[PDB]
Amino acid sequence: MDARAVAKRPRDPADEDNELVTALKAKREVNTISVRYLYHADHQALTARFFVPEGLVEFEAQPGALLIRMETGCDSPRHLYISLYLLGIRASNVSASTRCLLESVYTASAARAALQWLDLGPHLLHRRLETLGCVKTVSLGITSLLTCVMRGYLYNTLKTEVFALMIPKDMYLTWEETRGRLQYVYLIIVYDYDGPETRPGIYVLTSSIAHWQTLVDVARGKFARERCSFVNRRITRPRQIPLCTGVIQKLGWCLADDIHTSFLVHKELKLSVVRLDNFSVELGDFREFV
């Protein structure tokens, strides 16, 4: 109400004493806990812990990955978290040399359950997946406790280092010849309908495009080969009703200039991967198109 009250600048939390400190200031009683500076008080990024089976910790131990949840008809586990690298054995896009490489790393029996579950169902793969975020600060153990990001930049605690996002080279492609100053990262799944079985076909795709209309127009370019298949399957198989030639969804955005190629190193085997740098997370739901 006072004219000085509207004169005041917006309040500065950092100038103010910490809430734990303030109650101690009223009693003037020191405690063993160091309340002088609470950690994670400044992070815009939001996170949530994910318990994980020990057999899927590999590759994720390097900071920067993709945890997509996988629903299952089993009553336990009801949701087996899946690394994108674990999904590479399933994707048709991966080279047979690259596929044989990481597949040897997934010798764990807990990882073996994942491939068994993708195949048994009739439902399409994109319906069973759900994007969550990215790895940082792996706990490592019989039950790993990853601190997956929900919306914000990956980085080490106390801002000491900004974690890069890792993406396999086979799944990455560039539609534009000249990068823009900004480009959103759209995770994409495109089926290639055929006959005995519908293979997937993962393609993470950075693009300067933001609007949904122009984004799915360029997607109709190289993916038109599946578009001829999805229609040809319709005249071929009455009663059968294939749906969704592909799916697009936002994953985040990057500064484009910081991007450069790299390679992960785990279990002796190397694997070249595209390396997004300052990848702010911005989750986007799956969007169907034909």
Binding site: E177, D217, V218, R220, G221
Partner: protein, 49 residues
């Protein structure tokens, strides 16, 4: 005939995407491949019958 002329000229045959062709007129593109070695500099010529 349209394909036979390109062998006589050596020009590569475009197969541009329709979405690319719209931006192709709205702006431009470096449709000509860069040479493996610039012995001197940028090429420059024109034509007036």
């Amino acid at each position: 005939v349209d394909r036979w002329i390109r062998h006589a000229a050596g020009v590569e045959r475009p197969q541009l995407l329709d979405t690319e062709t719209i931006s192709m007129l709205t702006f431009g593109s470096m449709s000509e491949r860069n040479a493996a070695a610039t012995v001197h500099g940028q090429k420059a010529a024109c034509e007036l019958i």
